[PDB]
Write a protein that binds this DNA or RNA. Structure first.
Ligand SMILES: [Mg+2]
Ligand SMILES: [Mg+2]
Ligand SMILES: [Mg+2]
Ligand SMILES: [Mg+2]
Ligand SMILES: [Mg+2]
Ligand SMILES: [Mg+2]
Ligand SMILES: [Mg+2]
Ligand SMILES: [Mg+2]
Ligand SMILES: [Mg+2]
Ligand SMILES: [Mg+2]
Ligand SMILES: [Mg+2]
Ligand SMILES: [Mg+2]
Ligand SMILES: [Mg+2]
Ligand SMILES: [Mg+2]
Ligand SMILES: [Mg+2]
Ligand SMILES: [Mg+2]
Ligand SMILES: [Mg+2]
Ligand SMILES: [Mg+2]
Ligand SMILES: [Mg+2]
Ligand SMILES: [Mg+2]
Ligand SMILES: [Mg+2]
Ligand SMILES: [Mg+2]
Ligand SMILES: [Mg+2]
Ligand SMILES: [Mg+2]
Ligand SMILES: [Mg+2]
Ligand SMILES: [Mg+2]
Ligand SMILES: [Mg+2]
Ligand SMILES: [Mg+2]
Ligand SMILES: [Mg+2]
Ligand SMILES: [Mg+2]
Ligand SMILES: [Mg+2]
Ligand SMILES: [Mg+2]
Ligand SMILES: [Mg+2]
Ligand SMILES: [Mg+2]
Ligand SMILES: [Mg+2]
Ligand SMILES: [Mg+2]
Ligand SMILES: [Mg+2]
Ligand SMILES: [Mg+2]
Ligand SMILES: [Mg+2]
Ligand SMILES: [Mg+2]
Ligand SMILES: [Mg+2]
Ligand SMILES: [Mg+2]
Ligand SMILES: [Mg+2]
Ligand SMILES: [Mg+2]
Ligand SMILES: [Mg+2]
Ligand SMILES: [Mg+2]
Ligand SMILES: [Mg+2]
Ligand SMILES: [Mg+2]
Ligand SMILES: [Mg+2]
Ligand SMILES: [Mg+2]
Ligand SMILES: [Mg+2]
Ligand SMILES: [Mg+2]
Ligand SMILES: [Mg+2]
Ligand SMILES: [Mg+2]
Ligand SMILES: [Mg+2]
Ligand SMILES: [Mg+2]
Ligand SMILES: [Mg+2]
Ligand SMILES: [Mg+2]
Ligand SMILES: [Mg+2]
Ligand SMILES: [Mg+2]
Ligand SMILES: [Mg+2]
Ligand SMILES: [Mg+2]
Ligand SMILES: [Mg+2]
Ligand SMILES: [Mg+2]
Ligand SMILES: [Mg+2]
Ligand SMILES: [Mg+2]
Ligand SMILES: [Mg+2]
Ligand SMILES: [Mg+2]
Ligand SMILES: [Mg+2]
Ligand SMILES: [Mg+2]
Ligand SMILES: [Mg+2]
Ligand SMILES: [Mg+2]
Ligand SMILES: [Mg+2]
Ligand SMILES: [Mg+2]
Ligand SMILES: [Mg+2]
Ligand SMILES: [Mg+2]
Ligand SMILES: [Mg+2]
Ligand SMILES: [Mg+2]
Ligand SMILES: [Mg+2]
Ligand SMILES: [Mg+2]
Ligand SMILES: [Mg+2]
Ligand SMILES: [Mg+2]
Ligand SMILES: [Mg+2]
Ligand SMILES: [Mg+2]
Ligand SMILES: [Mg+2]
Ligand SMILES: [Mg+2]
Ligand SMILES: [Mg+2]
Ligand SMILES: [Mg+2]
Ligand SMILES: [Mg+2]
Ligand SMILES: [Mg+2]
Ligand SMILES: [Mg+2]
Ligand SMILES: [Mg+2]
Ligand SMILES: [Mg+2]
Ligand SMILES: [Mg+2]
Ligand SMILES: [Mg+2]
Ligand SMILES: [Mg+2]
Ligand SMILES: [Mg+2]
Ligand SMILES: [Mg+2]
Ligand SMILES: [Mg+2]
Ligand SMILES: [Mg+2]
Ligand SMILES: [Mg+2]
Ligand SMILES: [Mg+2]
Ligand SMILES: [Mg+2]
Ligand SMILES: [Mg+2]
Ligand SMILES: [Mg+2]
Ligand SMILES: [Mg+2]
Ligand SMILES: [Mg+2]
Ligand SMILES: [Mg+2]
Ligand SMILES: [Mg+2]
Ligand SMILES: [Mg+2]
Ligand SMILES: [Mg+2]
Ligand SMILES: [Mg+2]
Ligand SMILES: [Mg+2]
Ligand SMILES: [Mg+2]
Ligand SMILES: [Mg+2]
Ligand SMILES: [Mg+2]
Ligand SMILES: [Mg+2]
Ligand SMILES: [Mg+2]
Ligand SMILES: [Mg+2]
Ligand SMILES: [Mg+2]
Ligand SMILES: [Mg+2]
Ligand SMILES: [Mg+2]
Ligand SMILES: [Mg+2]
Ligand SMILES: [Mg+2]
Ligand SMILES: [Mg+2]
Ligand SMILES: [Mg+2]
Ligand SMILES: [Mg+2]
Ligand SMILES: [Mg+2]
Ligand SMILES: [Mg+2]
Ligand SMILES: [Mg+2]
Ligand SMILES: [Mg+2]
Ligand SMILES: [Mg+2]
Ligand SMILES: [Mg+2]
Ligand SMILES: [Mg+2]
Ligand SMILES: [Mg+2]
Ligand SMILES: [Mg+2]
Ligand SMILES: [Mg+2]
Ligand SMILES: [Mg+2]
Ligand SMILES: [Mg+2]
Ligand SMILES: [Mg+2]
Ligand SMILES: [Mg+2]
Ligand SMILES: [Mg+2]
Ligand SMILES: [Mg+2]
Ligand SMILES: [Mg+2]
Ligand SMILES: [Mg+2]
Ligand SMILES: [Mg+2]
Ligand SMILES: [Mg+2]
Ligand SMILES: [Mg+2]
Ligand SMILES: [Mg+2]
Ligand SMILES: [Mg+2]
Ligand SMILES: [Mg+2]
Ligand SMILES: [Mg+2]
Ligand SMILES: [Mg+2]
Ligand SMILES: [Mg+2]
Ligand SMILES: [Mg+2]
Ligand SMILES: [Mg+2]
Ligand SMILES: [Mg+2]
Ligand SMILES: [Mg+2]
Ligand SMILES: [Mg+2]
Ligand SMILES: [Mg+2]
Ligand SMILES: [Mg+2]
Ligand SMILES: [Mg+2]
Ligand SMILES: [Mg+2]
Ligand SMILES: [Mg+2]
Ligand SMILES: [Mg+2]
Ligand SMILES: [Mg+2]
Ligand SMILES: [Mg+2]
Ligand SMILES: [Mg+2]
Ligand SMILES: [Mg+2]
Ligand SMILES: [Mg+2]
Ligand SMILES: [Mg+2]
Ligand SMILES: [Mg+2]
Ligand SMILES: [Mg+2]
Ligand SMILES: [Mg+2]
Ligand SMILES: [Mg+2]
Ligand SMILES: [Mg+2]
Ligand SMILES: [Mg+2]
Ligand SMILES: [Mg+2]
Ligand SMILES: [Mg+2]
Ligand SMILES: [Mg+2]
Ligand SMILES: [Mg+2]
Ligand SMILES: [Mg+2]
Ligand SMILES: [Mg+2]
Ligand SMILES: [Mg+2]
Ligand SMILES: [Mg+2]
Ligand SMILES: [Mg+2]
Ligand SMILES: [Mg+2]
Ligand SMILES: [Mg+2]
Ligand SMILES: [Mg+2]
Ligand SMILES: [Mg+2]
Ligand SMILES: [Mg+2]
Ligand SMILES: [Mg+2]
Ligand SMILES: [Mg+2]
Ligand SMILES: [Mg+2]
Ligand SMILES: [Mg+2]
Ligand SMILES: [Mg+2]
Ligand SMILES: [Mg+2]
Ligand SMILES: [Mg+2]
Ligand SMILES: [Mg+2]
Ligand SMILES: [Mg+2]
Ligand SMILES: [Mg+2]
Ligand SMILES: [Mg+2]
Ligand SMILES: [Mg+2]
Ligand SMILES: [Mg+2]
Ligand SMILES: [Mg+2]
Ligand SMILES: [Mg+2]
Ligand SMILES: [Mg+2]
Ligand SMILES: [Mg+2]
Ligand SMILES: [Mg+2]
Ligand SMILES: [Mg+2]
Ligand SMILES: [Mg+2]
Ligand SMILES: [Mg+2]
Ligand SMILES: [Mg+2]
Ligand SMILES: [Mg+2]
Ligand SMILES: [Mg+2]
Ligand SMILES: [Mg+2]
Ligand SMILES: [Mg+2]
Ligand SMILES: [Mg+2]
Ligand SMILES: [Mg+2]
Ligand SMILES: [Mg+2]
Ligand SMILES: [Mg+2]
Ligand SMILES: [Mg+2]
Ligand SMILES: [Mg+2]
Ligand SMILES: [Mg+2]
Ligand SMILES: [Mg+2]
Ligand SMILES: [Mg+2]
Ligand SMILES: [Mg+2]
Ligand SMILES: [Mg+2]
Ligand SMILES: [Mg+2]
Ligand SMILES: [Mg+2]
Ligand SMILES: [Mg+2]
Ligand SMILES: [Mg+2]
Ligand SMILES: [Zn+2]
Lengths: 118, 131, 122, 204, 59
RNA sequence: CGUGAGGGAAAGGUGAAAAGAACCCCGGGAGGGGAGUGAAAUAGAGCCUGAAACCGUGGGCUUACAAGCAGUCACGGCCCC
RNA sequence: GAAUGCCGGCAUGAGUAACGAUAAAGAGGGUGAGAAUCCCUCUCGCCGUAAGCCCAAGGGUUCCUACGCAAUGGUCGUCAG
RNA sequence: CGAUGUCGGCUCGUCGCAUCCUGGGGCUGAAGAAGGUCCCAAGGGUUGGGCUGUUCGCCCAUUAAAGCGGCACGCGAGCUGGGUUCAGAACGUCGUGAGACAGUUCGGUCUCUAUCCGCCACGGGCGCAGGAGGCUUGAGGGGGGCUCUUCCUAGUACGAGAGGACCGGAAGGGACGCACCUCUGGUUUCCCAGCUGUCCCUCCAGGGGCAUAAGCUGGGUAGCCAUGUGCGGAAGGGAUAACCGCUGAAAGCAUCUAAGCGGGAAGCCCGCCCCAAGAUGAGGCCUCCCACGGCAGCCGGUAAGGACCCGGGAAGACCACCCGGUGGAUGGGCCGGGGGUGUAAGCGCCGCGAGGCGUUGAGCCGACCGGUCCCAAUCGUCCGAGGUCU
């Protein structure tokens, strides 16, 4: 039973799954758009959206919280100066997932794009 | 529908607001209504509250004391109609929500670990200076 | 919540100090004894020259338990030890005084003398 | 017989005569009568109750004609109560009064594929003393050459729950008609949000 | 365990009967409203990169 | 294969003649389709003949209330000559 | 037609068990007919009395570079002992 | 004997009845209470320990009772391996010896993959003469079925006393079963905090990795749970068993019986709960579609509807089931509430300092109860009646 349990496992233990989310965030925040598997894409939304929201608050505390997951000061600086202000009036929904047509050849994995919204 | 609001609505007839706010580490005297034959009296249970277990109307709290060489703990529904009143006997300051660790401490070690909460003692003195 | 092998303190002055439940006297096959229930027990430790001695097979009533006791008012009570008072086949105490608090459930179960001999009834 | 359809909302407890009383709260009515079963027409007696209004843009045409013949707005759920002919065109919580006893039928929570220890309270095997990969296993399932088969109804692992269960003789603790609310003392099958049926008890 | 083993060779009939549920079902494909190419529903078109009526992707 | 003494296989055939398929077409190639050679190309080199088990595509009859060493005797239905 | 016969071929089990340490992955860029698997960058993890370095046995070109992917590689392969 | 694994235990049952208990009876050397003995009765129940490999048995403490047997001394492709039952070793004993002993003693490899039948679950197909969406009847199955104490009647009947009822009535239990999570108590792999060592970011401060597949520790929501909570065994009706009768001949009397009628068990049928029309004997009711083109047949487009695809779900291995798909609150985000943790960072102030106080129940913050179209269920496709005959 899994009744009302939230959050995928992605066949990873605690620290690997957390490092997976942190690494995908750095990649998405760096390039604006990435391609992953659909399951990874869907779980990445909530993770990044939270970091973007804290960037919108903008205070020192928020920056130190975000840094726990992103670590790269120049990247948090990009998040606060460039990324977050284009979401000033947007309340949630800072990322989007769109499914791709062709599967990955070596294992059939369905793929999806994740990107930051305009 | 809002199932949570309906539950809160069923509980509304039974919520009370006359009782004083307290924290784990405070010393409390619970005046509790008790049957014994062929009458019902009020018995006071006084001790350190070591746990407030919150769930709205279903919040409960646990009070520990030593009676005649034996430790005793009582769990009380915070909205029980059988509670006449609760008196704050002392404000203690703890560093954590659950004080189970005092079940293993000598009385001296407890007095050291749960020192008087000056900030909230003054708060009780300032208030209660009512008009 | 007492069963065979469980050790209990002796909350009286019979001379016994530790008893070991060997039976819950509650029917054909009760699994546990709580406050107010009677047990058969072996005396595992006694002070010199008491009414009961080590090796005696005695009856006792459980007067307080470490497993918290639930009550119809929604409250509960829990003691630091598992304690019993040694009784005769008439449910009367074999000592002349009982030590520590005792559960109020005892009164309702017909152990009136033990309830009165106690210093506190919770 | 008298019954009503409902939704299980959640559990709490009330205080009554200085006793804590565990209750399950049910949002029961109101239930329009959508069809009556008669001995002349259908060979038996029962009332088809309706419950919870529905978006008509979701109700297909044969269902719409069934409501229209009853003069009833589109409802999410149709269920029959056997041997019940209510006088009005709408059944509400007021058919029950405090102190009455009821039977409640729900769809129990679903364990999915359940082992023999969860499903049937089998004892399993030792966890040490050489026990070898059989800690939760059923043990023997039979005999030998006679009868050389396994009984029908043998207790084995498999799907468990998400089935109709009726708990009987539950005390109605309160009725709150303003909110179509029924308070039943005790536990009722299924999850919060689940459809339940509340009937007058068959225990005398 | 004691190494269970098939008792009899499976007949051609029983082998192929077991396989009566093995046929593939064809892929679900809709026309892309922009370039008319056949493509899975709810995917960005792989022929023109449109989805929800706008260009999402270089192809 | 065995440290070693020693053990110890499988594996033949295009066609009369290479005339062994230029060139074009799909394909990354493999493979094929045309062209062409030949009396013959299911003699095209994974090559004489090419059985059987075994696998497949097409067609005729038949089969989802039925008890079977699978056949045999009878009758009836359908298909074919 | 049988010798748990001999040699060979091909079935069944079956799209089943398994794919060889639970140190662990993610993304971007490139190459290419083809990329989870090759190259490059960033992030993550693991060893560090070793899972790093040198030497002797044994092995015998496996070394370096170019070209290549039928087979070998437990998948893939543009990579490679 | 080209192998039918062999004791005991554990697990899982099921059956017989020569019945251990519970229910119903006759006789009694049955006053009562308690027994004895036989009859009916297999529905349910039949405890936990000490010893020994033990079966059995004895013992301890209980119990309504601690029943006896069958199922390859039920069950090793289910487990165990103490015993027995190879190779080692020793004792007693026997034998000159090698060695020998249902004598003893210590040790001693128990095999990942289920094809068919069978069993537990779950689908796919076709059928149920038109095709569909609902709601149902219940043939037939299954589940369950236990029992104790105290009290009232009444210290009455009975008995010299001790003791002590029937019948009827009330309360409280034990074990078992089903469901549940309000309470009590667990878990809660990252929800919060504290801590050590090391390496790193960025020097301070603040943080991150690793120390487990949580480094350790104190806590802990939802869920899943028992130790926790609710509820069940019935009642009631019908027919019976042993047994007891009414009326009553054969047989002037007598006889429960030959005609006929009554009473009478935890047992039998029904009643309760669950499955159930593949019940091919394929049931019933409500509602929806329609007689479309071309040659009990076919071909294609439609109809009511349905499937696909997608967002999901206390539903779930896949499948299925259920909800939703912009005419939308389905998941994700964001907002509020709950809940947990327990006073963040930064700054000010006190201290030489570790620290302390204030800002501050602060900061962080999974799942729970809701709100909100910010993100995503875009756009679509394919099936699908024309109703045989008497
Ligand atoms: Mg489940
Ligand atoms: Mg699990
Ligand atoms: Mg969810
Ligand atoms: Mg999940
Ligand atoms: Mg997580
Ligand atoms: Mg995992
Ligand atoms: Mg995996
Ligand atoms: Mg992995
Ligand atoms: Mg890790
Ligand atoms: Mg770790
Ligand atoms: Mg999914
Ligand atoms: Mg998409
Ligand atoms: Mg796809
Ligand atoms: Mg590949
Ligand atoms: Mg609630
Ligand atoms: Mg409301
Ligand atoms: Mg007192
Ligand atoms: Mg105290
Ligand atoms: Mg009061
Ligand atoms: Mg002694
Ligand atoms: Mg004491
Ligand atoms: Mg239901
Ligand atoms: Mg199991
Ligand atoms: Mg269990
Ligand atoms: Mg169960
Ligand atoms: Mg067990
Ligand atoms: Mg166990
Ligand atoms: Mg064991
Ligand atoms: Mg073993
Ligand atoms: Mg083993
Ligand atoms: Mg094990
Ligand atoms: Mg087993
Ligand atoms: Mg048989
Ligand atoms: Mg199911
Ligand atoms: Mg009330
Ligand atoms: Mg629920
Ligand atoms: Mg095994
Ligand atoms: Mg085995
Ligand atoms: Mg096996
Ligand atoms: Mg094994
Ligand atoms: Mg095997
Ligand atoms: Mg076999
Ligand atoms: Mg075939
Ligand atoms: Mg088959
Ligand atoms: Mg192109
Ligand atoms: Mg050799
Ligand atoms: Mg050699
Ligand atoms: Mg040789
Ligand atoms: Mg040769
Ligand atoms: Mg030649
Ligand atoms: Mg030749
Ligand atoms: Mg060419
Ligand atoms: Mg080419
Ligand atoms: Mg080409
Ligand atoms: Mg070629
Ligand atoms: Mg070709
Ligand atoms: Mg060619
Ligand atoms: Mg020619
Ligand atoms: Mg010729
Ligand atoms: Mg030929
Ligand atoms: Mg030829
Ligand atoms: Mg020749
Ligand atoms: Mg040939
Ligand atoms: Mg050939
Ligand atoms: Mg052939
Ligand atoms: Mg074949
Ligand atoms: Mg064919
Ligand atoms: Mg039939
Ligand atoms: Mg037929
Ligand atoms: Mg025949
Ligand atoms: Mg004939
Ligand atoms: Mg022969
Ligand atoms: Mg052979
Ligand atoms: Mg053979
Ligand atoms: Mg052979
Ligand atoms: Mg042969
Ligand atoms: Mg051979
Ligand atoms: Mg062979
Ligand atoms: Mg094969
Ligand atoms: Mg083979
Ligand atoms: Mg498969
Ligand atoms: Mg298999
Ligand atoms: Mg498998
Ligand atoms: Mg292997
Ligand atoms: Mg596998
Ligand atoms: Mg392996
Ligand atoms: Mg591996
Ligand atoms: Mg790349
Ligand atoms: Mg690339
Ligand atoms: Mg690759
Ligand atoms: Mg490739
Ligand atoms: Mg590389
Ligand atoms: Mg390391
Ligand atoms: Mg070192
Ligand atoms: Mg050399
Ligand atoms: Mg070599
Ligand atoms: Mg070199
Ligand atoms: Mg080389
Ligand atoms: Mg090299
Ligand atoms: Mg190269
Ligand atoms: Mg290759
Ligand atoms: Mg290759
Ligand atoms: Mg290749
Ligand atoms: Mg080559
Ligand atoms: Mg290979
Ligand atoms: Mg390969
Ligand atoms: Mg390999
Ligand atoms: Mg290449
Ligand atoms: Mg290589
Ligand atoms: Mg033999
Ligand atoms: Mg053999
Ligand atoms: Mg044989
Ligand atoms: Mg054999
Ligand atoms: Mg038996
Ligand atoms: Mg008998
Ligand atoms: Mg008996
Ligand atoms: Mg009797
Ligand atoms: Mg008598
Ligand atoms: Mg007598
Ligand atoms: Mg008798
Ligand atoms: Mg008799
Ligand atoms: Mg008799
Ligand atoms: Mg019986
Ligand atoms: Mg039976
Ligand atoms: Mg029996
Ligand atoms: Mg015993
Ligand atoms: Mg022992
Ligand atoms: Mg011992
Ligand atoms: Mg034993
Ligand atoms: Mg024994
Ligand atoms: Mg013996
Ligand atoms: Mg003896
Ligand atoms: Mg007794
Ligand atoms: Mg008895
Ligand atoms: Mg037997
Ligand atoms: Mg045998
Ligand atoms: Mg025998
Ligand atoms: Mg024998
Ligand atoms: Mg046996
Ligand atoms: Mg036996
Ligand atoms: Mg056996
Ligand atoms: Mg075995
Ligand atoms: Mg055995
Ligand atoms: Mg066996
Ligand atoms: Mg076997
Ligand atoms: Mg077996
Ligand atoms: Mg066998
Ligand atoms: Mg042994
Ligand atoms: Mg031994
Ligand atoms: Mg022995
Ligand atoms: Mg031996
Ligand atoms: Mg041997
Ligand atoms: Mg030996
Ligand atoms: Mg010896
Ligand atoms: Mg000797
Ligand atoms: Mg001898
Ligand atoms: Mg001898
Ligand atoms: Mg001699
Ligand atoms: Mg001698
Ligand atoms: Mg011999
Ligand atoms: Mg011997
Ligand atoms: Mg022997
Ligand atoms: Mg022997
Ligand atoms: Mg010996
Ligand atoms: Mg040893
Ligand atoms: Mg031995
Ligand atoms: Mg084997
Ligand atoms: Mg397998
Ligand atoms: Mg099978
Ligand atoms: Mg078979
Ligand atoms: Mg079906
Ligand atoms: Mg189907
Ligand atoms: Mg009917
Ligand atoms: Mg029936
Ligand atoms: Mg049948
Ligand atoms: Mg039945
Ligand atoms: Mg009396
Ligand atoms: Mg008298
Ligand atoms: Mg009576
Ligand atoms: Mg009872
Ligand atoms: Mg809760
Ligand atoms: Mg809880
Ligand atoms: Mg709670
Ligand atoms: Mg708790
Ligand atoms: Mg975290
Ligand atoms: Mg650190
Ligand atoms: Mg440093
Ligand atoms: Mg640096
Ligand atoms: Mg620092
Ligand atoms: Mg590191
Ligand atoms: Mg690690
Ligand atoms: Mg950590
Ligand atoms: Mg520590
Ligand atoms: Mg805890
Ligand atoms: Mg923890
Ligand atoms: Mg929790
Ligand atoms: Mg329990
Ligand atoms: Mg009768
Ligand atoms: Mg006569
Ligand atoms: Mg007469
Ligand atoms: Mg008669
Ligand atoms: Mg009668
Ligand atoms: Mg009669
Ligand atoms: Mg009578
Ligand atoms: Mg009866
Ligand atoms: Mg009964
Ligand atoms: Mg049904
Ligand atoms: Mg039907
Ligand atoms: Mg039906
Ligand atoms: Mg039939
Ligand atoms: Mg029908
Ligand atoms: Mg349509
Ligand atoms: Mg799903
Ligand atoms: Mg699938
Ligand atoms: Mg539906
Ligand atoms: Mg739908
Ligand atoms: Mg749509
Ligand atoms: Mg629309
Ligand atoms: Mg939503
Ligand atoms: Mg939402
Ligand atoms: Mg929230
Ligand atoms: Mg809050
Ligand atoms: Mg709070
Ligand atoms: Mg502070
Ligand atoms: Mg601060
Ligand atoms: Mg200073
Ligand atoms: Mg200050
Ligand atoms: Mg909040
Ligand atoms: Mg959140
Ligand atoms: Mg939108
Ligand atoms: Mg709206
Ligand atoms: Mg389209
Ligand atoms: Zn397109």
């Amino acid at each position: 039973m899994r009744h009302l349990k939230s959050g995928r496992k992605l066949n990873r233990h605690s620290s690997h799954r957390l490092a997976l989310y942190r690494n995908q965030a750095k990649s998405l925040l760096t390039h604006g758009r990435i391609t992953t598997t659909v399951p990874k894409a869907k779980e990445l939304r909530g993770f990044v959206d939270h970091l973007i929201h804290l960037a919108k608050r903008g205070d020192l505390h928020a920056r130190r919280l975000v840094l726990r997951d992103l670590q790269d000061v120049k990247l948090v600086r990009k998040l606060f100066d460039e990324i977050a202000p284009r979401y000033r009036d947007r309340q949630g929904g800072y990322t989007r997932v769109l499914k791709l047509a062709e599967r990955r050849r070596g294992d059939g994995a369905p793929l999806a794009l994740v990107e930051l919204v305009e | 529908m809002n199932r949570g609001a309906l539950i809160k609505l069923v509980e509304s007839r039974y919520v009370r607001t006359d009782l004083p706010e307290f924290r784990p580490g405070d010393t409390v005297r619970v005046s509790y209504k008790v049957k014994e034959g062929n009458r019902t009296r009020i018995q006071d249970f006084e001790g350190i509250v070591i746990r407030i277990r919150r769930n709205g109307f279903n919040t409960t709290f646990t009070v520990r004391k030593v009676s005649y060489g034996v430790g005793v703990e009582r769990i009380f529904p915070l909205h029980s109609p059988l509670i006449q009143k609760i008196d704050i006997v002392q404000r203690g300051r703890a560093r954590r929500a659950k004080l189970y660790f005092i079940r293993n401490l000598s009385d001296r070690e407890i007095r050291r670990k749960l020192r008087a909460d000056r900030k909230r003692i003054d708060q009780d003195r300032a208030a209660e200076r009512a008009a | 919540m007492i069963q065979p092998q469980t050790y209990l303190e002796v909350a009286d002055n019979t001379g016994a100090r530790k008893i070991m439940c060997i039976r819950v006297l509650k029917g054909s096959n009760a699994k546990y004894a709580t406050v107010g229930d009677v047990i058969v027990a072996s005396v595992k430790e006694a002070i010199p020259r008491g009414a009961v001695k080590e090796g005696d097979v005695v009856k006792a009533v459980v007067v307080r338990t470490k497993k918290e006791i639930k009550r119809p008012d929604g409250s509960a009570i829990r003691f630091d030890d598992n304690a019993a008072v040694i009784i005769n086949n008439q449910l009367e105490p074999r000592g002349t005084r009982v030590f520590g608090p005792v559960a109020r459930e005892l009164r309702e179960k017909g152990f009136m003398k033990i309830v009165s001999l106690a210093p506190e009834v919770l | 017989m008298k019954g009503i359809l409902g939704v299980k909302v959640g559990m709490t407890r009330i205080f009554r005569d200085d006793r804590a009383v565990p209750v399950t709260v049910i949002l029961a009515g109101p239930c329009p009568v959508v069809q009556r079963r008669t001995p002349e027409k259908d060979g038996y007696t029962a009332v088809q109750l309706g419950f919870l209004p529905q978006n008509p843009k979701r109700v297909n045409r044969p269902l719409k004609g069934h409501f229209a013949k009853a003069g009833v707005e589109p409802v999410r759920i149709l269920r029959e109560i056997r041997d019940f002919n209510p006088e009005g065109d709408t059944v509400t919580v007021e058919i029950f009064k405090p102190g009455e006893r009821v039977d409640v039928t729900g769809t129990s929570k679903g364990r999915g594929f359940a082992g023999v220890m969860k499903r049937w309270n089998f004892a399993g095997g030792p966890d040490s003393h050489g026990a070898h990969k059989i800690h939760r296993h059923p043990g023997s399932i039979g005999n030998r050459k006679t009868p050389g088969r396994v009984y029908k109804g043998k207790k084995m692992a498999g799907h468990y729950g998400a089935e109709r269960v009726t708990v009987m003789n539950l005390e109605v603790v309160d009725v709150i008609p303003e909110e179509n609310l029924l308070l039943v003392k005790g536990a009722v099958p299924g999850p919060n949000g689940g459809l339940v049926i509340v009937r007058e008890t068959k225990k005398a | 365990a004691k190494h269970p083993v098939p008792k009899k060779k499976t007949s051609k009939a029983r082998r192929d009967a077991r396989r009566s549920h093995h046929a593939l079902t064809p892929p679900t494909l809709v026309p892309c409203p922009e370039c008319k190419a056949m493509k899975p529903p709810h995917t960005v078109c792989p022929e023109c990169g449109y989805y929800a009526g706008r260009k999402v992707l270089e192809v």
